[PDB]
Amino acid sequence: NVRQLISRLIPPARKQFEHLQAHRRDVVWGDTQITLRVRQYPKSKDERVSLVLPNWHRVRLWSEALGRKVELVMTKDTLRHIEDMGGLDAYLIKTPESRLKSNPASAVKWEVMSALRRRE
């Protein structure tokens, strides 16, 4: 039914969905999941599909691997995940390259690996 409910989107939710489809690979997507809010009216013949908009913050994480801070856009729950499994270094090492659906996470991942390898 989901392929139907995407086609039943109100124009603000549809424009927000197009922007989500454009700028997904620009921000960190650790455990982030987009969601539709379809509300069910009991006096029937009305199913209004919308979007549950994610919340975004520009947190400045300190990398304990290489001596700098990086700024990068995240959600609350992926910040929970990163700061509750060990930090940016442990996340960028132990989450390999495909659960990262993100470009700056991949770039800082390569910089952590290269700087750490030259640090050996």
């Binding site: 690979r25 509300r39 069910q40 549950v52």
Partner: peptide, 25 residues
């Protein structure tokens, strides 16, 4: 007059699991 307050439901929009790599490197 009648009451028509809706019941909310959240559908997880399946989100293909592991990855693909057809995008920009």
């Amino acid at each position: 007059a009648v009451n028509n307050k809706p019941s909310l439901k959240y559908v997880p929009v399946p989100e293909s699991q592991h990855d693909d790599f057809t995008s920009e490197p």
